[PDB]
Every structure is written in structure tokens, then in C-alpha cells.
Amino acid sequence: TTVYEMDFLADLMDNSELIRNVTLCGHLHHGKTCFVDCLIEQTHPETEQERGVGIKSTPVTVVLPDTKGKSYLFNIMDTPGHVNFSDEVTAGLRISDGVVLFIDAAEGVMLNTERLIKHAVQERLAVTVCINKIDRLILELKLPPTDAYYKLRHIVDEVNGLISMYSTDENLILSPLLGNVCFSSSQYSICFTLGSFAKIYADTFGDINYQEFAKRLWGDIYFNPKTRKFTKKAPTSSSQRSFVEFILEPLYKILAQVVGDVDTSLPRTLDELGIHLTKEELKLNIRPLLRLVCKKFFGEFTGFVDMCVQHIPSPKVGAKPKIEHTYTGGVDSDLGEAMSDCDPDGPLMCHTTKMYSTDD
Amino acid sequence: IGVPIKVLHEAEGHIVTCETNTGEVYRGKLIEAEDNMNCQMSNITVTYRDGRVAQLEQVYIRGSKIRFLILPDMLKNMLKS
Amino acid sequence: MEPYYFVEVQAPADCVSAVYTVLARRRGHVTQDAPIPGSPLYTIKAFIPAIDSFGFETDLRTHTQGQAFSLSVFHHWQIVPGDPLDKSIVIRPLEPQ
Amino acid sequence: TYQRWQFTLPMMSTLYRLANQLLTDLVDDNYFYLFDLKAFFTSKALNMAIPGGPKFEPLVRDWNEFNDINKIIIRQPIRTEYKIAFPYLYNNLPHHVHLTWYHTPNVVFIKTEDPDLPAFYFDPLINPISHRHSVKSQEPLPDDDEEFELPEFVEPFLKDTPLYTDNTANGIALLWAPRPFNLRSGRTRRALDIPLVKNWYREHCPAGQPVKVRVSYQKLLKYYVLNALKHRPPKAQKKRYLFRSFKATKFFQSTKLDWVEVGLQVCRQGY
Amino acid sequence: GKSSKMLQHIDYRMRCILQDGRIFIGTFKAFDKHMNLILCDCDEFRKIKPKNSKQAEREEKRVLGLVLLRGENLVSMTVEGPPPKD
Amino acid sequence: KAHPPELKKFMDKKLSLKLNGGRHVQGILRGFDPFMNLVIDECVEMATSGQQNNIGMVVIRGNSIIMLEALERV
Amino acid sequence: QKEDMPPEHVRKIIRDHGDMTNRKFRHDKRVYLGALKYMPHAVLKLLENMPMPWEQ
RNA sequence: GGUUUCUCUUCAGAUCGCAUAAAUCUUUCGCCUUUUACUAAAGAUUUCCGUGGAGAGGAACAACCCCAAUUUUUUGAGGCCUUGCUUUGGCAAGGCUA
Ligand SMILES: Nc1nc2c(ncn2[C@@H]2O[C@H](COP(=O)(O)OP(=O)(O)OP(=O)(O)O)[C@@H](O)[C@H]2O)c(=O)[nH]1
């Protein structure tokens, strides 16, 4: 043993305020590599494999559109999650600026997840969460939609308690209202934040203000139909919270229609959502069909890029609270500040952390 | 939304310029833009009806008050039309 | 002084006793065992001398038909229960002390 | 020509339940931990043999310091199962060894008892969430009494549709079922190509059967492995069609007979 | 009724005269709801447009380039050139 | 639909409004409505003769609203 | 095409030839013999379609 | 302008055909007087049972009512005086208005 687009990539590199450097971390088998794979196929329609375990990290840099269309350049450091390989994570954790911690919906937090939130807060990065693998609550565990709410709330509160345990300053508490957490199913092509879901609600239905809407969904707000005005506790209807009735129950019904009643009720329900599908594409099996419908309805990936763009340092802002730790002097006279400029100019101070051997 | 409005919003952050309804020009970096064309620009250069050129910190103008808009050589690259 | 390993074992409800026995053979001291909220699984947290940690994972999985599964991390050192300097201690050279 | 079936989900559910007897009630793959093709390939390569697995003839056929018996600490004896879990760490001269490992996320699918209770239903089997913590938290909660209101067009995205039916619990059970049954459509296979009993002898602890049948288990596993190991791609193709070439001549005719009739014909002609 | 008449002049050369009277010569790569025009490599000519003139044809001309105008001032649209295949 | 001005971060800031007729004024933008009409206190109109004479709070008509440029760093 | 014969055609031919002892045939002797080379095909094709105990 | 079917021609599986048989050669191995028939490992190569791709024909059946004051089909952007300018043409500036 990209013609008119890599130039565009170059100009994006040159802006240095349209790029985000993020590390994709979490526990073992919690969804990272499949996230990345389905994502590169979103962009390109163009030892390990036998192991089923990733050993060494891999970086990807790709151009992603947000919920407004503005393209970004994304630096994604896909790490391994086996607690024995935490070495690789440290590497990414230096040369990146934020962390997307992938948590499992069915398991929650375990060893490596808490240890990685520790390693991430002690290196003063940004911290975002993707509660991934949510179908394991609907199809596998078979949970009433309200107890799905309970479990999601629990995971978020526990990760919140730990991130408070290792960090003194109550600068950030995570909850999807702030745009901290996506909800995901890597393989079933669904990733959404309250922002993205409320914008979907608006774009297909009437003109409702998606931002003020998204401020109302998570977290014990109820809604009374007659007044059409969300309230804190005052339904005695024995009804669900805004979250359940508006985001989960519709998602339960989407899935239950796809896997249960694919032959009879599915064309009707698909009409009621706006998705049209060929005869040929309704002859798929249930997993490819489910993923295809969910992709056709949920759009590509906006929840993630939205949450990240909204809470990434953007290396231009970036560098300054970093060279405290990285640099041995930090800022004294010449180079600390020069780097803090992050200007493509002069000093050229780079940090190399990995060496990927060429096969040959 | 239209293809031009999508290009304009996507041009946010890049270097752009515009020619207003009153005959004045304003270039700058992309600050903010929306589907209503209400354009916010920052650190721009401004050229009046005679040609007086000067600097502006940040400004926000209604959509209908702009006539044309010049973008960099990037946007030309949805090629389906 | 010798290092210790922190072990976290996911397991079905029944096979808890199984892992217990394994940890006994290897000087375990299982600390905690707790339900997983919203799951049919229990989580076990235990310590184990890194000496006896060799093959503990595969031993665990073999005895329980793959159902259980552990990861391990170094946690802290500790006093090994011997007297390092005693000439009155002779070592039978292949059986375990 | 009878390729390509497509079926309804009730069809599949009854078919499943009817074939339930000839089937494995395993749901995932970490049952076969050191009991898959790669574990056997490695064991065969190292000439060590796991408890219930096959045994093969050795692949090919003085002093060292590391085995100086004064310089070891023996707390746990190394045993062949470790030597096959980690081929390279635990073995000198590991050659033609396949490196097997898997911690495949234990799948948690709760078989129901009756079709009565709803599909989505907290099961007694699941551990109660009862998530407790401090005074839990408070939100960036944009309190009402300022304003907000939903234009009386929008609604829960589809509320004319019930959560479940008499077809969803079934439809989910069908999602983790053995290979033919977790499908909806495929090509049709030949009748000899369908082994009915493989999923049986591939199991791990027969636990109290006579030594007779355990030796039979191991020899069936051996045959299985040798099949998988010596697999050659087709590598070549010339495709004489004997019977189309025959039928195209002036000497062969065609018909439909009772099976038994052409059976008696073939035997008479042999004689 | 055919929905084709706009695309027929789409992707081809075009001379646009706004409510301002000037000429913008550019590729009609698309239109929008308001009649907005996003055409690249455009040329802004103000004096006249050259039509086989023995005197000259290049006067009071600048390169506007990617010009994205709002359809509030879209007045007259003609075909000034063919499409260059790049 | 009905997107209001991005004047949240711009609220409570001194800006000059240039609107039709060459109408140049200075005034503090503190709030407005979704039609892009403004409500600016401290309005001191900058007439052509150059004299800036204060008028106070009024309704900054977005109908002919041309542009507003603040005097702070928003 | 070549469409099907009636079954009685086969049945009559084979019951006629019987066991090739009557000299009235005496020429199909040679082909009868020469067809032995292919009888392991007839046997395989026959046994791979046997009628599967839910069928009569 | 499509499916099903039949026939005819032509090109491939690189993890397959979710199944899995025999043969040849070369080298060790075990049966033991000889050879076939065997053992059971490795390697190199073939045959057989199935499949795919492409194309040609031929066949059967589907089928020639309210609407605008920030972006265009309502918009009051109106005039002139003077000045300066430029070769006239024309450009800019202030005012008067009703
Ligand atoms: N049920 C379910 N499983 C998922 C989903 N997304 C990913 N998976 C799992 O993803 C696994 C694929 O490899 P990954 O787990 O993504 O790799 P990883 O998370 O980085 O783990 P390591 O590579 O060892 O660090 C499969 O085993 C699936 O179990 C999902 O949305 N639903």
C-alpha cells in the first residue's frame, strides 16, 4: 500500500469573529462520533472501527449556517471518552475555547462526565451541554411525557450542582432558557434548543414572536388556552407544564405515529406537519424512515450552532482570560498583549499539542 | 424571505456598504441586519451629497431609507436560483 | 504506599451480588450502591488496589454475561498493610502473600 | 418472480409472535462479549481456548528475564480470558490476532405483559426518579403580569392526534427484535439459506446439559468460525446457465408436475 | 401564469434603470418579493449607456460589483448582455 | 412579521435623528414601537441656520424616519 | 417463447420407454446412458424442492 | 410519458450471499506396511449453488374577497427667485411660499 468555497473559507478565517473553537467531550459512547458524522454528511453530501471505541481525537473544521443564515467556521475537537484516554481531552482543552459536553438521557451523569466538567471549569473554558440520545426515553424506556420532563430536569439540575461545586462564582447556571443545552438524537437527526423549536413553531404557524416564546417554555410555566397567556402555577386543570404540552407531547406523537402507525395514520399526520414524502421514501424501514421524517421537519442542526455561537468566546474575544493560564508570564510587555490582539500580524506565537502520524 | 434579504443578513460581519434614498453613501463592517432591512452599521465611512467623507461610530437606519447596497467579492459563490 | 483505583459499575438489578463477590477477591471495599433514577439499572462505586485491578473489568463482564461494566481511575495512595523492613519475613516465591 | 416483500406492521407482529418459539430473547450484543467471531479468531491465533468455545490446531507450532520467579509479584494469576481480552498487553508474539472490545450501551427495553395498559407507561420495573437535591433552583423566569399572549391560531403542534393506539406498543416491540422481524421489507431468500438453529448454539452457558450436548455446542461453534474465517470474495464470474442453454435446444420440453411424480421419474431414470 | 418570464431574464445580463435614472449593468442572478436585485460585478453608469457610438461609450462609469438594491426603486429592466458561463 | 427595532441595547442613548426635509435634531432615544417610530426626550432640533433649540420629548415619526446615529458607544 | 406442454406427454413417454429392454427403442439407449453425467444435477434440483410439512 | 413479465446480448461483488460445499497445487501434521480414500493447520489458486449492473427486443397492464404613510400596480418630494460654478448647455447653495 472546493474551488469557489475554500477561498470563502479563507476569508472566514480572516474575519476571526466568525469562528468558534469547541471541544466535543463527555462520557464513553454518549454520542460524539455519530454527532460529528451525521454533521459532516449535513455539510458534505460528498483499530478504531473494529474497536467501536475511539482512542485518539480527531479535529474537524466546517462551515455551518445558523438560525439566521450567517455562515460560521467551526473548530470541533471530537475527543475519545474512555476514562483511560483523558489525555487526549486535555490536549483539546488547551487549544480550544469552549466545551460541548454530551450527556446521556438514559444514564445521566457518570464518571467521565463529572470529571470533564471539573477539568473544563479548572481550565476556564465555556461550558455548554447537549442532552443527547433522547429517543431512549420514548422508544426504549417508554416514559410518560411528563416523566421525560422529570428526568431531563434532573440531569440538568445535577450537572448544575456539580459545576457549582468545582467553581465558586455563580456566573452561570445552565438551563435551556439561557441557550445552554441542546436536546438531541444524533442518529435520528434531531437537535434543538428552545430557541430553535420556538422559531420552528413560528415559521410554520402564525407570526408569533419566537424569542419571547422561547423565554416561556422550560421550567414549570403552565398555559391556559382561554386566556392564551402563560401563567405560573394556576391551572387546576391538572394539566402539564409548557414544556410537556408544547415540545414533548408533540414529539411523542411524531414518533408514535412513525413507528406504530406507519401504514394508516402517517400520511395524514405528515400532511398536518407540511412534510411531503414520496411513495419510494415511505417504503423505507422504520429507523431510516424515522430519521428521514425528523430531518425533514426539524431542519439540519440549528440548535447546536445557535447555542454555541451564542455562548462561545470567539477567539478574538477569546485569548485574554486564556493567557493567564497558558502563557508563563501571561501579560507583561510584549507578547501577552500581542497574542491577546489575536491579530494576523507579527509575533506568530503558536501552540502545537498533537502529532498525527502519517500512515506511510 | 427573499434571496437578496438572505444575502444581506448573511453579509453581517463582513465589509459592506450602501447608498441611501437621499443620495448618501455609508460603508462599514456588518453590525446587524434583519428581515425588515433595519440595518445597524459600526465604524463606517460616510459620504454626503457633495462627497464629504468622514467616520461614524454606530448607526441604525430603516430599510426603506436605503436604495442600493454593495457587498464584497464573497457573496457570489444558493446557486440554484 | 500504593495507589488506588476508583471503579464505577453499571449493572442490572440482579447481578449486584455478582460484582460484590469479585471485589471481595481483590480487596475491594465497595462504598456505594444506588438506583439510577429513571432506569432499570444500579450504579456501584468502589475502590480497588491498582495491583488487583488487572483484568478486573473482563473478570466482571465474564462472570455476568456482559451485563455489568466498569471504568477505573486513579484516586489516592494508601498504606499497604505490611511492614516493609522485617528480615523475619521470608517470601514463598510464587504463591500469593 | 417473487422477490421483494413489503408488509404491514400487524402482519409482522403476528408473524413475530408465531415464530416466538424458535427465537432468541436477547436484545443486544454485549452478551457475546468474548464469544464473537473476533474473540474466536484471536483465541485460535494464540492457541488458547476460552471455557465454552472451540479449539483449533496450533497456527504455526530458552531463558528470559521477565519470568524470573524472584522478580514478580503474583496477586492474581493471569488467565486466558485476560490474554484474549487484551491481545497485545498480555502476550508475547501476538500475530494474526484481531483486537476485540465492546462496551455497547446496555439497551433497556421493557417488555410489557398485557396489551391493556397504555404504551407509554411508567413501569414498576424502572426505578422511581424521585430526583432530590437542594432547594432545587430558580430560573431566569420571565414572570407574567407584564404581557404575553398566543395568537389564537397556534396550538400544541398536533392535538387532534392521540398519544398511542392499539398498534404503537407492538410497533415498538418490533424495533428490537431479531434480524428478519425488525424489518418491513427486503428481498426473499432461498430456503436452504435460512438456518433456523444458529441463534441457539451461539449461546454461552448451557448450564447443566450432558457433556454430550456441550461438546456438540463447541463443535458447531468451531464450524461456524471456520466458515467466517475462510471467507473468500467471489473474485471471478463466468455464468453458464445450464438450464437456459438446455431449454433453448430442440430436445428439451417443459411442464408442471406433482413433486412426487417427478420424484418417481428421477428414481426410475437413475435405475 | 407560467412563472417562467422572470427566470428567462434571470441568470442573464441585464440593464436596470432605477427611480434614480442611472444605469446598473449586471448579471440578473435572481429577484425577490419587493423586486430586490442582488447582481454581482455590476457597473454603475450615469452619463449614458453606449450604443454603437462613433464618439465614445465609456463615460461617468464606476464598478459597483455585488450590488444589492431594494425593489422600492425598481423602475425599468432590459437585457444588456448575455450570460458569461463562469 | 412585525419585527421591532433593535433598540434594546440602543435604548437610553443620545442620538442625532436625520429625517426628511433635511430635518436634523438631537435627542435621547429611550424607547419606541415596532413601526420604527421613536419616543425621544431631550430633542434639540438642528435647523439649517445652525441654531439647536431644545423641544424635549416627542414622537420620532419612523414614517419618514431616515437615520439615527448615537453619540455613545453602544 | 416456449410454452408448457401437457403433463400427459411426459407421463406417456416415460411409461412407454419403461426399462429400455424392448428393442423398439434401442436407439434412445445411447442417449439414456449418456445422460448419466447430469443425474447429480437432477438429484440436487429435486431434493432442494421438497414439499415442506405444512403442504400436502 | 411507468410497473409486471419473457427472451436475447454485456459488465462486476473487495469485508457477502446476515448463507456457506467440493477440487487442485505446495509445505508441515497424524493415521501406517503400498497407492487411492483420509486427518487438520498454513498459503496460493479454481469449480459449483445463488445475486448485482448495463443494454435490446418482445409482451401484459397503467395513460394520449378585502388593501396599504419606512422598500415598489394611490402617495402631499411641489415650483420659482437669487447666487457661485463651469465655454453655453448644466451642477451646487440659501430663501419665498399656499
Ligand atoms: N439510541 C440512540 N443511540 C445513539 C444515538 N446517537 C448515537 N448513538 C450511539 O452512538 C454510538 C456510536 O458511537 P459513539 O458513541 O457516538 O462514539 P463516542 O460517543 O465518542 O464514544 P467513544 O468513541 O468511545 O468516545 C452507537 O453505539 C449508538 O449507540 C441516538 O440518538 N439514539
Ligand SMILES: [Mg+2]
Ligand atoms: Mg468515537
Ligand SMILES: [Mg+2]
Ligand atoms: Mg506393487
